[PDB]
Amino acid sequence: ARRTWLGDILRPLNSEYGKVAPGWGTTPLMAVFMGLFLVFLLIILEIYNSTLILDGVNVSWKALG
Amino acid sequence: RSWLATSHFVLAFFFLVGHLWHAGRARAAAAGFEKGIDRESEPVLSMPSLD
Amino acid sequence: GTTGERPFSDIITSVRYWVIHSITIPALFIAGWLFVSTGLAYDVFGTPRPDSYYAQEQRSIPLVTDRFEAKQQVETFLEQLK
Amino acid sequence: VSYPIFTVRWVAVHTLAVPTIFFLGAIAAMQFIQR
Amino acid sequence: METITYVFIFACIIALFFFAIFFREPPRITKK
Amino acid sequence: SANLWERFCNWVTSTDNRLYVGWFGVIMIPTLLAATICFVIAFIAAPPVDIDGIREPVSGSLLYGNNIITGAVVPSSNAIGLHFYPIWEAASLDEWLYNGGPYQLIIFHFLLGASCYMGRQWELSYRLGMRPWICVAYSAPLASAFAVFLIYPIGQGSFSDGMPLGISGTFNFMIVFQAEHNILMHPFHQLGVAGVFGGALFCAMHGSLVTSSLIRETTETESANYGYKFGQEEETYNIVAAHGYFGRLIFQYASFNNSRSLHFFLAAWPVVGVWFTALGISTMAFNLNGFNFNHSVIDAKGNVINTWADIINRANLGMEVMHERNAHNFPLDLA
Amino acid sequence: MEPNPNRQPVELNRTSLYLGLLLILVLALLFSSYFFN
Amino acid sequence: MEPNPNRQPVELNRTSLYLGLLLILVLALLFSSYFFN
Amino acid sequence: GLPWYRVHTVLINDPGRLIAAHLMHTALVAGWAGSMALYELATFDPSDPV
Amino acid sequence: TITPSLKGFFIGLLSGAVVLGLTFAVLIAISQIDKVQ
Amino acid sequence: GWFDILDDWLKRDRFVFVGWSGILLFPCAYLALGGWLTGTTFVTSWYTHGLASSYLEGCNFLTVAVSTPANSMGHSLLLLWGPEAQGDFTRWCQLGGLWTFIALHGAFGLIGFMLRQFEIARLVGVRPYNAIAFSAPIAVFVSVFLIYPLGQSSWFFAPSFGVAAIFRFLLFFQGFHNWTLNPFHMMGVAGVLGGALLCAIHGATVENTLFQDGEGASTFRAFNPTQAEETYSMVTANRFWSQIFGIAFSNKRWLHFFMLFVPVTGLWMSAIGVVGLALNLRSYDFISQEIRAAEDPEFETFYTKNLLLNEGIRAWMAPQDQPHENFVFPEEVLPRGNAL
Amino acid sequence: LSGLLFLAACWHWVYWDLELFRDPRTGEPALDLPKMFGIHLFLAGLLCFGF
Amino acid sequence: METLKITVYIVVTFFVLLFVFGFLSGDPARNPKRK
Amino acid sequence: LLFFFGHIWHGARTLFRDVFSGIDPELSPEQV
Amino acid sequence: AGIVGIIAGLFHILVRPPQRLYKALRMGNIETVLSSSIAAVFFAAFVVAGT
Amino acid sequence: MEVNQLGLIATALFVLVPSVFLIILYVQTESQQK
Amino acid sequence: MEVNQLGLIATALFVLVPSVFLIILYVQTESQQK
Amino acid sequence: RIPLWIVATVAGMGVIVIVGLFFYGAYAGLGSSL
Amino acid sequence: IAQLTMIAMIGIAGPMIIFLLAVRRGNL
């Protein structure tokens, strides 16, 4: 090995290697943001594809200036 | 003239295939290896390496 | 080489199967038949009847020309006795 | 063995078999439509 | 110029063919 | 000398030659050499050829403005038709090159050699004590060359209508064929792509399955190929683990467990499919063309209701109407 | 410095050379026409 | 065939590579102007 | 030893030389960017934006 | 606010969740009926 | 835990393996095949292409199809409950809603299916080279049925699901894109054609280099399903091809990977070419050729000939192939040779 | 910037065996990916915000 | 030109004779076992 | 489109690192 | 997205990955970061090609 | 003819560079003792 | 400008070919065991 | 118990019949040309 | 008008001449 000034300061940030949470940890919470992300993307997609129209949003070169 | 010509070419061809098939088998049947290479006496293994 | 399911060979051979399927199989057949012969199919899928491609005089095609008011435009195409 | 009746295989089989014959009957009828 | 390039690559492939066939690695059995 | 001729026959038939010159080889080797040499010279330096016999020379050689993709060896003149046109049938080579002389010299020599090549694929198999039929598989690609270079010209009545010896020229043959015969709508052709698609499919199938079920004998940082030695006794892959996987992908009884039943299918499918596609070209050489569903479905009054088959016909007319501009003088194309 | 213990030797057999060269040349024979355009 | 006993191995050290490349490059930097003319 | 298409597997567990690699890569991409621009500036004509 | 196409989106977003629902509903149920070891 | 119990059930060895993948595969795969078979027999293409496309109208197995939506639709997803159909089912069919139905569903079905390959392989403990291979068919479907029309004006110019409807797609690419002249396509066919060769030549090689492991002529029974010795003489196979062709395999592990590489690589190259055709970045012409052809009226190649064929295809086909353009081409403006 | 990244690449190549890459426990080279991702993602979002 | 015809004909005859007289020279014999 | 393959490849090579280089014995399949 | 990225970042610096996931997504194996990154990379590519 | 000026060097470099790469490797493999 | 068309490839081949020769040898030397 | 060979031969003919019905329809139905 | 009556008989005739043999059990 070879210790350095910068290396020692950064030592803590890299040490908790294999450290995992027990069981299903935060998984179910994550699965909620995932489902929210999926719908979110689905929204902005259908907006871009003009499958989801909203008065106020005009998906064209217009609404610009 | 179209029906006859096409029909008999198909037949003639496949019969040329049948010929090759039955002529190739007969030569191997005669000499006696139409059922596989002899595991023991494998002919190729007795011929010099060309490499 | 085996799983839980009852070997097809036995079932396709069992008298019980045919006692069942001599009724079931032709039933679906007659049903599908009626589905067409009663002209219901024409309406379920908006498929034109032999006398419903054009108007009598008209020789033009009912091409949909805009997405949003398509449904409305289509209905208008059925209007001219098409 | 004491084989069961309704199984997953049974479901799969029918999802294809049942509509098929229903379609084979419909198409068979189409052969008589004219003008 | 173009003609030359085309024949050159072609001549090179034919050259490769030669070496590939007659200057391959001798296929040795068992003890390889 | 045990007898010169006896030695000669022993040398020819010898299985100790680097390349097995067979008895078929005695015909193949010279013929294939004449074909290739003439081709190469032609493809590079041959002058323009009046393919359609209408005094309208088509240049297909590199030195005459072509590249690899466009360049080709142009078929003999339509003025010659099915007549035999060797060099000694011309007043000069200038004339011979103008009427598409080289083409015949090549196709005849090739087809001859390519046939003996099939003949040799039996011979060596005979000399090595292995089963024949390898040549029977090669009969499929050969029968296509035959259909494309010989059978179709015979049927149509001219070698000028045979497939040219080039990339773009092959494209012309197809496009025009489609126009005159509607080949896409022909069962034999469809069987051809089926064998060809299926072939590539099964080639990937078998290829993958086997290579994925290899027994471990290699390091983590060592080529998985080295885990095999030329001349092994036992197998290099778990065919039983292969069948277990593929058997679960679809369902067990729809999976091979017999390597011999496997490789037969691997060979049977494409060969049979190409056999039909070759018979397709050979059948449509006598103008027994694909299905004609033009103006089939009509409405109750009599109006023509178009199908995709009709859209195909429009594309076909365009090919027909534009091909061989100045070659036609009369309404029907019966040639 | 310490000799890095993560390195391995590299290998390319004769066939791989041939298989390689065949790939390169024929690709060049295919794309050269479009390069000259 | 008998392995020909007349062959020796060939060698080119790292410096010789450097000395070589230096020669090739500077020659190219010298003659390139006359090549484009 | 290693096949030609595996030569970079020499870094899979060598964080130092892996960073050195990414550093070289990033340098190349940054190098391209600057010099690709110079090429455009040496050829672009601003005489008429219309 | 709340346009017809936006109303349609909810209908499709709701009819979709239902399908996911009934599917997993049935699945979780039948799964916990037999699996002995 | 219910999860591991849900897992337990799914990964149970049945007649038809389900698995986690199955939750995505079977629903889409069935709807895709079903949607096709439905439209194939019942739904029309009159209001969309001015075409009959079903058995109900009189089409046969070759001429039937599930035609693309109108050009008016654009790249709309065409949801049943979307602004176009507005929940109506009958309207949805007539607007070619079944096309985007089949496409999107089949797309996810191909995803589920490769996942199935991945999942099953993992369970059986075999290498996933079957999943890697299946990427080529994915690329094709994606590039052709999705990416290509996404580059064009609308879904209308995507290949319609049907036999004949695909044949026109071929002729179109010829007439309009000069697709045969594309280097990427050429690599495509080389792989498929070369792959269909490997398939043929290897099987035949094996069947005719077999050892004798039985006393019958039908050597099929004489195979050992439980490994052991090689069923065919690899050594004999080597010397054979080495003398007839000059080159021969000698490493089954390489021979089989090669059988994977060739057709997969080809399909991938052909995909790239199609991705280029979406923006219409085709390999239509050779500038050096056209320039000479312009100045010199006596210069003629098989390349120039083909372009004239394209001109004809475009002119005679465009009117009925692109209804939305209201094309009207007078007889006199139609490009024609002599007599014909 | 390219020139600087170049010199840096060289330093990290010669001085590859920094202790920072060694896990205190096992004494063998190791990188804690989950925490790294957190660090980078933070920097990413922080720079994204600013932009 | 009339010469070339003769030469070729001779040439072709040669190989063709070699072919016929080739398989005639007890070709079935030339093989591993039974002959 | 090309990077799709790279994802599929490396992804495979991560979840199948153990069965990489090949497989090994046993004979289970068609029986739970 | 910047703010969310800042928040999400702090999270992964603190909360450790659930055992189930760490095992599932073979974390602590850098060649799985590559698999996911590439996935994200080509996703973005398809998007920028579209816009 | 009226071709691309860069066509030549593009083809030249398309052949050499990767061919060169291989040969470098092959010859370096070939000379490994034992 | 109005330079030689072949100047580019002449310069290109003049660099690569001999440089290539060297690298081929060096790398083949470097990989010799012991 | 119904003998397998009978099941196939009956379902076999049954397929030829319905399929043959389709081919007849090619000369009578809407798929005609008359 | 409807010669399908013919085919039918001659069609079932084939399997009959072997079915009767499955009854009288012999020589198949």
Ligand code: CLA
């Ligand atoms: C799991 C299998 C599966 C999958 C992936 C799909 C996928 C799809 N189907 Mg589909 N379908 C399936 C099974 C499936 N199908 C089955 C079994 C049937 C038979 C009933 C159908 C019948 C069907 C029809 C009839 C149609 C589709 C269509 C579609 C497409 C668009 C649907 C859409 O917008 O999704 C919407 C996505 C969701 C609803 C997912 C939401 C999940 C989140 C986590 C739930 C959140 C809900 C909650 C209330 C949100 C709160 C947020 C708050 C702000 C309100 C899409 C490709 C359409 C199509 O192809 O258009 C061309 C179409 O018209 N499907």
Ligand code: CLA
């Ligand atoms: C000091 C840093 C710095 C700065 C200020 C610039 C500035 C610039 N660079 Mg540049 N560059 C840098 C470093 C830098 N560079 C380095 C180190 C490299 C080498 C890798 C490059 C390579 C480079 C190239 C190759 C190019 C530029 C270009 C440009 C110009 C246009 C930038 C643009 O459009 O953004 C582009 C914006 C993006 C690519 C957005 C990336 C966002 C990704 C998709 C998100 C990543 C996922 C993320 C982690 C998800 C979590 C986020 C969270 C918030 C949710 C601009 C002058 C362009 C130019 O005109 O040349 C001069 C150009 O083509 N740069």
Ligand code: CLA
């Ligand atoms: C984020 C990008 C990325 C990264 C970091 C890697 C990293 C890696 N890949 Mg990989 N890969 C990627 C994308 C990437 N890949 C993509 C998109 C594909 C699909 C085409 C692949 C397909 C792939 C395969 C099939 C294999 C790898 C392998 C490997 C490993 C060894 C690499 C090696 O030694 O090759 C060294 C390669 C060479 C010396 C030859 C490269 C010659 C190229 C093709 C010519 C073009 C060069 C040109 C400058 C590239 C321009 C960059 C472009 C993006 C702008 C390494 C961990 C190998 C592995 O896992 O080992 C077991 C392996 O077999 N990759």
Ligand SMILES: CCCCCCCCCCCCCCCC(=O)OC[C@H](CO[C@H]1O[C@H](CS(=O)(=O)O)[C@@H](O)[C@H](O)[C@H]1O)OC(=O)CCCCCCCCCCCCCCC
């Ligand atoms: C118009 C008539 C024209 C007549 C032509 C004049 C006579 C022909 C002279 C041939 C001179 C060239 C020698 C070539 C040597 C060689 O091939 O390998 C040398 C080996 C070694 O054996 C050989 O060599 C042995 C001696 S030695 O080992 O080489 O020293 C020898 O003992 C043994 O008998 C012999 O088999 O020869 C063979 O393996 C026999 C097969 C030779 C095949 C001929 C070429 C096949 C071409 C097929 C068609 C290709 C189409 C185009 C391809 C691009």
Ligand SMILES: CC1=C(/C=C/C(C)=C/C=C/C(C)=C/C=C/C=C(C)/C=C/C=C(C)/C=C/C2=C(C)CCCC2(C)C)C(C)(C)CCC1
């Ligand atoms: C060191 C130093 C320096 C310098 C620096 C420099 C000078 C840099 C440069 C850099 C550079 C100058 C870089 C460059 C780069 C480039 C690149 C990197 C490119 C690449 C390219 C590519 C890769 C391409 C590819 C391709 C082709 C070939 C064709 C086809 C298509 C494609 C695109 C794929 C200074 C003084 C400042 C200071 C510090 C020190």
Ligand SMILES: CC1=C(/C=C/C(C)=C/C=C/C(C)=C/C=C/C=C(C)/C=C/C=C(C)/C=C/C2=C(C)CCCC2(C)C)C(C)(C)CCC1
């Ligand atoms: C659309 C839709 C849907 C779906 C539905 C479905 C899913 C259906 C299905 C359907 C189906 C599923 C159908 C099927 C059909 C099939 C058929 C119709 C078949 C036929 C066949 C035949 C005809 C055969 C022939 C043959 C062959 C091919 C082989 C050889 C011989 C013979 C001839 C036998 C839903 C409601 C969800 C929603 C809305 C939309």
Ligand SMILES: CC1=C(/C=C/C(C)=C/C=C/C(C)=C/C=C/C=C(C)/C=C/C=C(C)/C=C/C2=C(C)CCCC2(C)C)C(C)(C)CCC1
């Ligand atoms: C699918 C399948 C199958 C089935 C098949 C079938 C279904 C068959 C049928 C067959 C048949 C169905 C046959 C029939 C036959 C018949 C016959 C052979 C008859 C003959 C007769 C005669 C020759 C006579 C005639 C007559 C009369 C009747 C009257 C008029 C006059 C005269 C005397 C001429 C099997 C099981 C194999 C297995 C595999 C799959």
Ligand SMILES: [Cl-]
């Ligand atoms: Cl033409």
Ligand SMILES: [Fe+2]
């Ligand atoms: Fe095999």
